[PDB]
Each structure stands twice: as structure tokens, then as C-alpha cells.
Amino acid sequence: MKTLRTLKISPNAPDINSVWLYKGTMKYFNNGEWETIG
Amino acid sequence: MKTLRTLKISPNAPDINSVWLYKGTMKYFNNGEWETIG
Amino acid sequence: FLNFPRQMLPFSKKTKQWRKDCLLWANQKTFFNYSLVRKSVIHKKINY
Amino acid sequence: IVGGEPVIERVNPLKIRIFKSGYSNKVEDADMIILEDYWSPGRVIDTYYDVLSPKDIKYIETMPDYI
Amino acid sequence: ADFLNFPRQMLPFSKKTKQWRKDCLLWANQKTFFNYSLVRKSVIHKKINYDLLNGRLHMSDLELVLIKAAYIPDRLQHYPIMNSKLNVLRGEESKRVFDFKVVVTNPNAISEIEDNKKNELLQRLQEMITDTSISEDEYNIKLEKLNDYYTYEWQDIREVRANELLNHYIKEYDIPLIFNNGFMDAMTCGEEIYQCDIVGGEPVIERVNPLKIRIFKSGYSNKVEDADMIILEDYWSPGRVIDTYYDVLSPKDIKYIETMPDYIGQGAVDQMDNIDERYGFVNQNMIGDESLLPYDLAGNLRVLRLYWKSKRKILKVKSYDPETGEEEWNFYPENYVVNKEAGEEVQSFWVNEAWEGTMIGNEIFVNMRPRLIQYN
Amino acid sequence: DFLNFPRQMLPFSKKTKQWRKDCLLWANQKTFFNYSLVRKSVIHKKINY
Amino acid sequence: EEWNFYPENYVVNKEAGEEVQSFWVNEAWEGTMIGNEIFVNMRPRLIQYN
Amino acid sequence: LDTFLNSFPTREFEDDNEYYWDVIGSSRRNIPLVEARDENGVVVAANAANVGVGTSPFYLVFPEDWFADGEVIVGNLNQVYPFRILGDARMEGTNAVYKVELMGGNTQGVPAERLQQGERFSIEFAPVEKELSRKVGDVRFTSPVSMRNEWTTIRIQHKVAGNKLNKKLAMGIPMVRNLESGKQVKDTANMWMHYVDWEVELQFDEYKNNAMAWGTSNRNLNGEYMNFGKSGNAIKTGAGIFEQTEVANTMYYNTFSLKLLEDALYELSASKLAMDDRLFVIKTGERGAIQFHKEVLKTVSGWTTFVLDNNSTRVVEKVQSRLHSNALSAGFQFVEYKAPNGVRVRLDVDPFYDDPVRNKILHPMGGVAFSYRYDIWYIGTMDQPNIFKCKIKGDNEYRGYQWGIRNPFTGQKGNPYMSFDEDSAVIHRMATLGVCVLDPTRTMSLIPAILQG
Amino acid sequence: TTIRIQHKVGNKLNKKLAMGIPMVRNLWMHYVDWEVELQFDEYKNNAMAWGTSNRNLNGEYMNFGKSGNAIKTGAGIFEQTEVANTMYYNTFSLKLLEDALYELSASKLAMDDRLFVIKTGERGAIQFHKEVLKTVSGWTTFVLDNNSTRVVEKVQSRLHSNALSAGFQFVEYKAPNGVRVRLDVDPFYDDPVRNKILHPMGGVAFSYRYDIWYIGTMDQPNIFKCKIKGDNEYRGYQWGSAVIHRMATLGVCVLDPTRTMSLIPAILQG
Amino acid sequence: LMGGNTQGVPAERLQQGERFSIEFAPVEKELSRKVGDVRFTSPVSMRNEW
Amino acid sequence: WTTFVLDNNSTRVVEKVQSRLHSNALSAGFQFVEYKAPNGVRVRLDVDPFY
Amino acid sequence: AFGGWLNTQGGDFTNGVTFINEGGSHEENPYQGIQIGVDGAPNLVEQGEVVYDDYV
Amino acid sequence: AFGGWLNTQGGDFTNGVTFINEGGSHEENPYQGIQIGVDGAPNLVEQGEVVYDDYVFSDRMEIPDDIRKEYKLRGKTFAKAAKSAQRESEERPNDPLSTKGLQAAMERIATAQEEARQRKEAHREG
Amino acid sequence: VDVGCAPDGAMQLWVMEYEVTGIGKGCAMCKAINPQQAEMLLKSNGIYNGSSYLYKVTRIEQVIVPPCNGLMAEQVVTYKDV
Amino acid sequence: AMQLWVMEYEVTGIGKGCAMCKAINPQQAEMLLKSNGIYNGSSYLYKVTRIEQVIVPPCNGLMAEQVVTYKDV
Amino acid sequence: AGKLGKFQMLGFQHWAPQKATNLMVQLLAFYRGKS
Ligand SMILES: [Mg+2]
């Protein structure tokens, strides 16, 4: 229902509407915070 | 093979050509079933 | 409207809506006449 | 006058409302005479071709087909 | 059925294409179950009137029946005591005077416009006789032939022609018999109808059978002329549809006349191939214990003529005479462009136009056009 | 019932003598419906005569 | 312009402006059967009531 | 609400009695099988051998006499097992059994699974020989059933004293009129009775138009009327526009979904409307268009195979302003969904659906609950008016005054025929009126369930 | 093939009658001249198109008539065209249709006359849209935009200035080497009386049938309707009672049935 | 209760604050007697100073 | 070649056709016939029925 | 054409006042005006002027 | 023959427009034309040119764009321009308004052909 | 058919589709006096009446009883829809 | 033509289903589903699991409920 | 993904006010036979 077209690898939180990629995780904006997958 | 461009934040299932994100788990549609990431 | 719109008017105040308010009155309040020298319509229709 | 020329009709006595005559045997003495009939759509355009607006031709045109 | 309307008549003349005229006749075939008017009786009420004069008693008309075998121990003999009363009135209408002459109503009323049109005629007759006469041998004969037309008038020449057409065709067609049969239709229906049109290039007059004419869209008018939509349905001979329409029938259409198979394409089949189940339902105001097929068991053809008043956009144009400062008015069609910088003002009107159409059988769509005899 | 008559949409050359004889062997011994659209039956009229 | 009605045997005189159209019209024909073996006068009827 | 009711034509009737109109189906039908019996009459079950194995006769018991003497009827697999009928139907009470052998050259017989109860059978044709052929086949017809509606008679009454005949209004506050629109418009007429008959034709226009649109038929399931008038007779009410339209295409919801609006406007007009006749124009409210805008927005976000550019949808248009050199604008809306195979859906937001004076239940998403109701009034063309306003020919509303020595409405001082002895003048007006929807299956509605049906 | 009809009776119904009852919430005179001329019109339409042959390989007929003579019936259009290039699929896939149309055109057709018109039903036209749409969904080399396809275009509306539309339908597929595969809907595939097996995706499961008539160019018609010169339709009236007899002979002819390819769902076979 | 209603109106639709408006005023055909009545309204004004 | 986005506007792989089924009707199909290699090389075809 | 006329009941009834419109001024017209009459024989009127009883 | 005629109901009804087909061009026809009349005595026309009231609308010229915007023509040729303004009165030859609508519209294409003729004659000598 | 229920006295049969958010879709058949009461029976007597906010009812359509035998209503919620 | 029967069935491999027929005995309600259902070409797919008559005097109650989960597929 | 019965076809053996329309009404809740 909330599409995230792009993925940005950066040590900072890039944007709400992009998927954050760090070293061993992949976080996304949900419930007003960054939730990691896995 | 099959290229996916979209990541959806939905409690229900998205279309088969978009990646499911829900509360901390990632699923992608492969071979007629929703294959989870973990 | 109450009656037929006021006829004792100057000619310039007999505008497009004054004539239409006259004619809309004939659409509504002109079915029942105590005609003094005619019979009723239901009486004449029986005769034909 | 209908169609530029004079015409004469007889009026159906059931379809004429003669108001405000003062116990008089004539009809020309009346102050308000209303003739309500059901004219054909062809007779509306014979009589009022030069005074119907293009909106009013559509209302004659968009009337429902009760044949 | 289940999808049609009458097509929109408030169109420009370029949009009234071949399919638009064909949709008008295919709508006309829908309204053949129906014959209702405000000043007419039903067809069953008229058809019971005629068969009383042709000696048929319908026992379902004078009582409730609680038969169909023709025997007076269960039926009733009919005694024609009404025919001798109506035969007095149609024997007397034949014996009344028939001197129907076109007359000039005001024969002493000669105007300058009546004076101008007479001079255009005698100039045109003078222009012909110089070409016909070859160097003064019979120019003096053609001159004295038209010298006695200098005392005639324009209303006299138009009355001479109008009587010369009527005097010939009363004596050719036996028009007195036509109105004498039409009188018999008037004492039985109450409706006396005649059609006048051009077939074969010559005019004709025929009495319309009142059991076969649908007079739609009149306004309680006693007259039949005042109708907006008339449908004449009859079964013609195959020779009559070539007696009338030889000059417009294509070689496709004369194969339908020759070999005539049953069709369902007459509005019963829709665009999505649905069949229409309300076609196979004839009414009981139109038929009874005494109609839509293209042909008959007598080898005839169904001919369905529709006459409707379409609406035409015209223009009312105000111009000025160049010589005198007098405003003048003219009527032009919608494809007329007004010559401005001449004071030329225009107003657009919508105006009746008599249209016609004819469907022979089920396939043959013929003479779908504006009616060329406009009674202007 | 239908009045099945031979084909008349022919050129004048193809209206040969067998075609005219086929059109004329259409009238022999035919049986039809007893009364026509505007005329009563023959057994009716012989009863009147 | 003038119009004439010709049969199908008539060939069109082109290069003079003749436009043609082909119509099918009625024709009164006649025939007699005498007995059953005599077949006589199978032809267009010669009094054409035109 | 009155502009909406004048968008429908009007029919003229002769009586105030019940009126009826008769609907029709097709003449073509297939018949479900009951039982199939072998050559000697012994029923065939599914775990059996083939039946017509050597072009041997067998039976088909059908619950109705529908088929004829020499026809060819087919099972669920048409043209593979053709069944020529032999002889007329033997009536086993109400049922009909036919002698039947195979037709299309089948020399192995029909399988036992093709002869079970529930299987439908339809007529193809009735063949004969070239030589000495006998009579075969028959012709089937179809019949009408009827629909039914009636009328509703309303009334009004107002009473004034006879003192108010020419009572001039010394306007301390300016006297206003209530418009039909709901607005209080100002008026300057100094007489009081101009504001008395204006509020009684305002109100009679409000009484008729709520009786034509909002109808409640009080005829019982046992065909009775329980609401009796003051004199003792039954107050008979006929259905309105919004009761006759809900009887066929009932649909209720909480959450709007486009997939059920699109697969139900295609189920009813599947092969019955042509490709150009499937324009379904939805009447809705202002808030029903926002709910429709989001569900098309949720639909085209599932079209991931396409990408939706700025260059075509133009959701960010360039504008000119003093604040910046290249300043942008924003905003878009989805107003039309084109279904597969010619079905289109359009939005017509009508102000009738949003009227908060009559609509009192609020939706949870704001606005009145009647705004979220989707109505497709016209599906295809019908060749006759589907919805029309039934009015009696001749029943002009009886303007009727009884009065005493003065009449303030007509303005009559001095009465020769007195009804009574008091300074009064009452108006009594009454109208017999109804509406009729010929085909409520040509009209699909979609109602929120919070209106509770 | 020879067909006959009768009806024992005039304008009134008789013993074979049906009523149609609709489910709503609160729950003339038959023109017998026109139903016989319609229900013999459809007897010939089922005989020409849905016909079955009852001959051996020895020439003998198998089904005999009421007089002892053999019933002569010839094959129909859908039985003559179902002898070659006919396939029965269980699931629809463009892998089978783009290859069957190619091997028919790699061995029979030049490269210019490779236009294949799929004459199918209405619900089979939606089935052709969704399986081209899944084929385009796997073309990940080319991204599809709204600038070319225009599934979201701008229409004029009162509600908003920038007001969009939505909707599209694939109706064509162009395989390699010029195999252009079009699509149209015949209305007779959605026939509710004749087609009784229902498909799970809505319809009557005969709408999901693809028929390619008219393969290539021939210099003559391949499929036509046969007829006898003169007048081959008869009629007859037997009076008691009145029995409206009708009889007609007919025929259809498919010259080359290898020039007709058909796809039938496998639930309509065997 | 009109509409043909037999089992009454629930008690949760009859609480305080439930809003009611006039629909219409139906009478019977034979021998009706008077129903319905007519309402009026009036405006307000405002003020200012210096 | 995922360095280039290959949009449908330039190739016209899916192109609009006019059919009675839908007002916005689409097609599909393409075929690579030529491959221009680097450094001047073009690769065309000549499909012969002899082969 | 509505200028000083009453085109009603199929007839064209006027009071004599002639609204000479739609042409243009004396300068912007090619024929220097509308030229309603010939009497000075070039009798020219423009779009704005109105005549009664041959007085403009 | 259908060229400017309505041959319905047995009679040959025309509006005046004379569609002259089946001839050929002036060089293709051995008689150098059609020779519709003897009046100049060799009045010769071709397969395209059309006559109304003894005025021939030529098929060889074209429509200049300054001559197209004024007088409001529809065809690309002066013969094709008269082949479009007669389309109302082709199906109604006997109407009073279509006669006036034809005579007025044929006078415009007459004076539009003369202005193209006078402009071509002035440009040729220059 | 005057049994004694709230809408005019007759029994009404309803077909309900929904989508339980985060769980899936389903079918439902019920007798109810209102279509509002039909969705209040899923929130009370349904499978997920404990987590009552997950019920997203999308269709409530009535069945009318025919005169004779036949399949009245059907509803399939297939796996490829879910 | 007597009673009403609401069924819960399960199409094998495809999904679940709910149905309602009108039959005299509940074996005939399975006949009117297996022959008139949407899976007519695959009539062996129906495995009915519950049939219950529409017993009127409640007239406010669920008769069939069948949800399809994300983990059943 | 399921139908619902909108009509039922029975034989006749399984069985005057004013007229709103004078012709008959073909419902959409009916199959129409196909020529
Ligand atoms: Mg084949």
C-alpha cells in the first residue's frame, strides 16, 4: 500500500520513501521508526 | 530472470511483481508462492 | 405570487420575469371557475 | 396569425377557460381566456419556428418516445 | 428490439447518412404491433364494422362466448339490413355534381408582381419563337398565336394550367370512383384517407385503406395532413415494386425479390446476436378470431413506407436592397455563408422537413431521403 | 405454399425455348389455396351460378 | 441532358458523354398449351400496353 | 432533490388504481436430466459400462415434455454425443421419457458419466431422409409474468384567521422568504398573505418530491394495509424511486473495492449489451468521488508492469510565480476506469446525495453517509422510458378553500355561501402521485451498509 | 443434409410452453406464423454449423428413418474444420499459441501473408488479454511507460482540472518472423442455451475457444454454404387441426480444413 | 409505523438527540380529512461603531 | 545493459491499435534484426527461403 | 435579425426604426459603409447609426 | 447516371448542376472534349469539369489559400468545390430554399474562380 | 412468509464477501434483518470476532428464494485471488 | 422444491467455497452443485463438508463462514 | 468469483389493471437466445 521504488545505501537515514541499506541489514520506515528485516 | 522494481508496505498481499514488506519480514513472489526472506 | 402579478405598472417594469410570473400563475390557479353563464365541463362532456 | 397569414379555428368548448365576464352572452367581453390543448410537435414548429431558442428545440427533441 | 430509439432529428444534413435513414425505418418496423391515436378507433373495432357489411357476424362481439364451426345450430345467421341504407348514400354521392374547378378567388385583383411575372412569360415565349420559326415563314403564324395572350393575366395562365391538369386526370383515372369508394370507408370507419404521390413520373391518387395506416403524433386534429409520422404497411405485388422502384433498385435487391428467403435480421437480432422474443407476439387490438413477415403465401412483398417530419436548420437573413433602403428577408439553408460588410444579419431557425423511406421485404431499403414533393 | 416460378433475371439470349417451355409447364395440374386475397373460391362461385 | 431507355443489346456510345445505368423492368410474356403435346406462342406478348 | 426528479420523464395514466407491466424471457431452453435407462429399462449409474454401444436404443427421463419426435438433442458435450429421439414422450406421471439412439456415427456408445442427473440437454435439429420422409420436430413458446405498483395520495392544510386579509407588514426586520433552494431570500411585499401561499407551495413541492423519490409501500406480505386514516380507510402508499430501484440489484458494503464494481457490471451486461452500449455513468456524492479516486489509485499502483510518468499523467505541472524561477504545482484525480471489453465507468457527482438536512447519519470518513452510495441508473438503452413519473391525467391538485365572512387568500370580502361562522380560511390541497421503474435489473446500485438497508 | 419440422395447431400457444421467473426482492397472442419460420431458421443454422456425419468407412449409413430409408446427414462446419490443426489445451499459454501459429506459418505461408485473426468469444478475449499481459510482465529489458502505452490519460472533468483515466486491453501479439495475431469477439460463443459447461473464470467455457478461419489467401472461398438452384425450401399445410410442415435441404463445404486452426478447451472433449 | 412494518422500531433508534424531519403527509383515497401544516422563519442583524 | 533504462516510448514495443473491444487497445511484439558491434561493425541479416 | 423588428407568428413586423448594424465604420469597410440606398447617390451608413423615415 | 440528378419515383429531377463524366481529358478524347452545345460553337469540357447555369467550373486549377479563407470553400479544386456545395440540393432538387442555397453558393465559386483567373492572368504577364 | 422478523415480516438471506486484513479473504452466508446486521454477525459470530477490526466486508448481496429447485448462490475464494 | 440448504465446500487445489441450493434432500443439493456449479468441467473437484438446512425461527444468524488464509496457499 | 441466481426458467406445467408499458419488458436478468 506504500510503495518504495528506490534503495539507498548510505550510513545516514536517506528518506522515508526509500529503503535504507547498511552493512548487514536493510531497514525501512514503519510506525514512525526504522525497522530492520530478519 | 524476473526483475522486481517495487517494495510494498501492506498487511495484505501485493501484486506478484512487487516485494512484500510487513512489520519486519520480506516476501517475494516466486513460482506461485510467497517466498520469505530470512 | 399571491394573485395575478400587478398589472398597474409602467411598461419598463414588465420585464421577462414579470411576464413569466403571470404565465406561471395561469399554470396553477386557473382550473376552477364559478362561471356565471356557462355550464360545468363535466356537464358538457356528458352531453357530447 | 399562424405562419404569417390569418387563420381561423373553432375552439373546443371543454378546452377553454373564460374568466371575468360580467353575466355577458359573448366571449370577447372576457378579461382572461386560456386555451390548453395538446398540440403536435409539428404544430409547435409551424407556429413558433422564429421564436424557439435552440435550447427549446432540444426539449422537443429529447422528449420520450411514447409511440 | 430491446435496443433502439428514434434517431436524433436535430442534426445537420451531412450527418443524416445512409445508416441514419436506415435506423429510422428499422424503428418504424418496431411500431407495427401498435396503432393508437386520439381520434381513431381500434383496428379490431374498424374490422368488425366492415365484416358486418361483408356479411360476417363475429359472435365474440355481440356477447360473451362460453363457436368456430360454421353451423347455425351453434352459430347465428347474419341478415344484411345495413347494406341497403349505406348503398343509398354512395349511390347519391355518385349522382351529385362533380364540377371541381380551380378558380381564381379574386379575378379582378391584378398586382405589379402579377404584372411582372406575366411579362417574363411572354418574353420567354418570344425567345422561343425566333428559334422555331425559320426566317419569317411561320414567324407571322407564331406571332398571332401569342398575340391573343396579351389580354390574358398571370392568374389566368396559372388557372388555365391548373385546370388543364385536373381536367385530364379526372377523366383518365376515374377519380369520381375513387372518392365514391372512399365515401364507403367513411360511413364504416369514420375515416376517409387518400394518398397522392408521383409514381412513374406521372401523378396518381389512391385511397388508403384505413386498416393499414398508422397516423402518429397529431394533436386531436380531424385532418390527416396534420400528422408528424405516418406508416403505410401493405403487401404489394412483386410487379408493383418494380413498377414503382425500378430506377432505384440495385441488382442485389432484385435477387431478394426473385429468391426470397426467411430472415430475422429485421431488428429481431441485436448487435450481440440476441434474438428478440417480443416480435413473436401479435396483439389482440390488431388481430383476432376473424403481419410482420416479409412476404406472403400469395407470393407478394411487404412494403413499409414511413413518412416523418425531420427538423432542418435554416437561416433567416436580413439584407438591404442596393437601390432602395428597404430591409428584406430570405430563407437559406445552413450551408450559406452570410456576406458581411453588406449589413447582412443572420438568425438560425429549426424547421420541419418532410422525409420518407421505404423498406421492401426485409433487406430492400429504398427511397430513404427527403420527400421530393414538399407541400410548401 | 409459395408460387415457385422459374428464374426471370436472365439475359434475353438465355431465355431459350426450353426455358419458355419450363415456364409453361408450371401451369399444368397445379393445386393452390382455395380463395385468393380479394376473390372467393371456385366451389363458392359455382354454387352461386 | 436527355435520357433514353435502351435494351441491354445497345452498346454505350462513349467519348460523347453517355453515362449508362442498367435497370431491370417488367415485360409481359405469353404462352399457350393445347392438349398436352402442342406448345405454341411462347414469346413476349406482342401487344405491350406501355 | 427536485432537479434530480425532473431528469426523469412523466407518464399519463387514467386511474388511481394499481398498474401492471409484464416482463418476458426467452423461448430457448435446455432441460436438466433426471434419469437415463438402458435398452431394457435398468437405470445407469456412474460406475457402469457404456450405454449405446452398438447403436442400441436407450432412454432419457426428463422432468417436462419439452423435446419432440425426430430431433437431435445433445448433452454437456455438444456434437460429440448426438441423440436422435425415437417416438413421442411417454409420461411417467409428470416426467417424460424418450427412446434415444446415437446419431453422429458413434460405434462405442455414450459413457456412463455423461448420463447423470443435473445434465442439461438442448435441441439442435430434426433430420429426415430424402425418400418418403415423415413428420418430425416441434416449436416452443414463452410466456410473460407481471410486475406491480400503485399510487400515493398526499395532502396539506394551513389555517389563518380572517383578520389577515390585507394585513400590511410594517417591516422592523425585513421579511424573508424561504426558497426552494433552502436559502432565505429577502422579499419586499408588504402584504402578509404573499408569504403564506408561498410557503404552502414551497411545502407542497417538498411533500410531492419526497413522496416520488422516497417511497415506502405499506402493503403486507399477506397483501394488507395496516395504517388506517382518520376516517377509517387504509392509507395506501406506493413505492418511490429509491424503493423500486433496489429490488433487483441489491449491493451493500463497508469497504469499497473496484474489483466487485467492475465484475458485477460485467456479469449483468456480459453478452447482452454491445461494445458501445456499456457506458455506466455513476451518480454519487462529493465524498463518494474521493473514495472512488483512492480505489482507482490503489488499482493502478498494482499495475507494476507499467510505470506512470510525470510526462503523461501531469501530476506536477509547472506554474509561474514570483517565489521561484521554476515553481511547481501538484494535484491529480482519477475520474474514469475503463474495464476490459468496452465497459467504462464515469463519475457524476450530484448535489442531491450530499444534502445534510435529510441525510443525518454521518460517514466515519466525513460527510453524510448517503454521499458514498453509487447508483448506475441507466444501463444500456431500453427503447422505452425505464424510469418515469406516474401522474394521473386530469388530477390537477384541488385548490380548495372553506372560509367564513372573509377570505384572506382570494381576497374576497363578503361570502354568499358560508361553510361556517368563524373568521377563518383553510387551504386543502391534495395530490395522487407515484413513480414506476419498469426494469429494476437495468439499474445497479451500491449502498453503504451503515444506512442499514 | 435434409431437415423437417411441423407444428400441430392461427395465433395461439400450444402444449410446449415455458415461463421465465426473475428473482426480484419483493417476490399477448403468439404469432405462430413467425415462430415456425424462426425455429426452422435455427434448425438449419444448427444443421449447417453443428452437423454430424453418420457414415462408415464403407459408405453405409447407420441411422435409418421412419420409412426405412437411411437418414442422409453430412458434416457441419465445426466438424469439417475440426479435422486438422485442432488443439485441446487445459491452460492457455502464449508458448503454445505463438508456436502452433509459427509452425503452421514456417511451412505454409510467405512472410507477408501471416495475419491470423483469432475469432473467439468475449471471455476468451479477456483470457487473451491477461496472458499477453503476463508475457509483457516478463519483458524486463524494456520498461513500459505511460508516455507510449497511455493507460493513464487525461480527460476533461468538472470535478478536477487534472483528472485522469485508467484502462487498457491487449488485443494483439506480434510473434517473431511477422506472425501478427489479432483478436475479435463473435457474439455466438457466449450462447447460454447451447453452452452448458461453465468455466471457472466466468463465462460458458465455449467463449474460451479460439478459431482461426481464413488462413492465407486462396483465390476462392474455402468455407461456403451449399444450396440447390431454383428453390430448395418447402412448406406445407395439412388440415384436419393444422400441421405446418416445412422441409429443406442444405450443406456446407470446407475445401481445405488444414487451412483452419482451432483452440478448444480440453473440458469440452471426450 | 408505515412501510408495512410489523415488528416495530428498535429502542436504540429512539434516544436523545435523534433528529427528525418531515417527509410527506399521506392520506387515503376515499373520504380523506385534513393533515399537514406550514412553517415560517425570520432573519437577524448586526452592528458596528466608530 | 542495465546501465540504460530502455523505455517503451523509443522502441514502441507495445503500440496502440484501434479495435472495437476497447477505446485504449494495446498490442505487443518486437524482434532484434541488427546488432551494431563496436568499432564500425554492423551486423545485418538476409533471411532466405533457400536455407 | 432582431434590429428594430418583431419576427413573430411567422411574420416580420417592424415599427420603421432600422438598426443598421454588423457592417463596420466608414473607414474599416471596403465599400465605405453598408450603402442602404441610392438617392447624393452614395448614401452610406455604418454599424452604429440608426435611421427613421430616411433621417439618420 | 447519378451525376447531379435524382432519378427517383420514375422521373428525372435535377437541380441544374451538370456532372460531366465518362469523357476523358481534352487531349485524351479524340473530339477534344464533350461538345455539350453549339452556341463560341465548340463548347468543350472534360471528365472533371462541372457546369451550373452555363458557367464551367474547371478541374485543372487549384484553390489558392487567400481565395479559400474568404468565400469559405471546401474542396481542393474549383470543380471539386462545386461538387461539395451542391450536396444539399442533390437530394432535394425541388426545394425553394435549396434552390436559393444553390444559386447563392454557385455565385461565390463563380466569383472565386474569376479572381483566381484574374490573378493568374496578372501574374503571367508580369 | 410472515414468520415474524424485523424487515416487514419475511426472512432475508445474504451473501457476504470480505477480506480479513493481514489474514486473507473469505465467503459468508447469513440470514439477517438488515445488511448492517449481517456485518455485525461476522464481528460477533465470525472466525475472527476476537480481532474484530480486521473484518473488511466488501459485498453484501441478497438471495431471493426461487419457486423451484436450483443452485441459488455460489461463492468461490480461490487461492490465486489470495 | 421444499427446503433450502447452505453448503461449505472445498475445491481441491484451487480454494474454498460457499454455496446455497434449494433441494428436497441434501444429497440432491450436492447434485445441484456438482452439475450447476462454476466447476462443471471439473465436477470431481467438489468435496462438500457441511450441509445445514435454513431453519427460519432464528432468522438472525450466520449459516456458512469460510476464510482463506495466506498460509493455506 | 461466484454467481447468484437472478432468474429461473420453468414450464407451464410447473404452475385487469391499467398498463404501465404497453409493450413487453425484456429484463437483463434473463439469458437471451442467440441466432
Ligand atoms: Mg481445422
Residue numbers in the entry:
A (entry chain Bk), B (entry chain Bi): 1 to 38
C (entry chain FK): 4 to 51
D (entry chain FK): 203 to 269
E (entry chain FJ): 2 to 67, 72 to 295, 318 to 403
F (entry chain FI): 3 to 51
G (entry chain FI): 354 to 403
H (entry chain BC): 52 to 504
I (entry chain BD): 203 to 211, 213 to 230, 243 to 455, 475 to 504
What do the paper's sentences say?
One vertex of the capsid contains the dodecameric oligomer of portal protein gp20. The portal is surrounded by the five-fold symmetric capsid vertex, contacting 10 major capsid protein subunits. The 12-fold symmetrical portal oligomer sits within the 5-fold symmetrical capsid vertex. The localized asymmetric reconstruction of the portal–capsid vertex (obtained without imposing symmetry), determined at 3.60 Å resolution, showed that a loop at the peripheral area of the wing domain, residues 268–319, is flexible and can adopt two preferred conformations (types A and B) in interacting with the C5-symmetric capsid vertex. In the type A conformation, residues 277–290 of this ‘capsid-adaptable loop’ are oriented radially away from the portal’s tunnel axis, whereas in the type B conformation residues 292–306 of the loop are arranged tangentially to the portal’s circumference. The portal oligomer positioned in the vertex occludes the binding site of the capsid auxiliary protein gp36, which is substituted by two copies of the portal vertex specific auxiliary protein, gp57. The gp57 dimer has approximate two-fold symmetry, reinforced by disulfide bonds between residues 47–47 and 25–88 of the two subunits. Notably, hexameric capsomers bordering the unique vertex contain trimer capsid fibres of gp21, in contrast to the hexamers bordering other pentameric vertices, which contain dimeric capsid fibres of gp29.
The virion possesses a short non-contractile tail extending approximately 44 nm from an icosahedral capsid. The extended tail barrel formed by widely conserved paralogous ring proteins has a high capacity for storage of cargo proteins alongside the capsid cargo zone, ensuring that the proteins required for the initial stages of crassvirus infection are carried inside virions and delivered to the host cell.
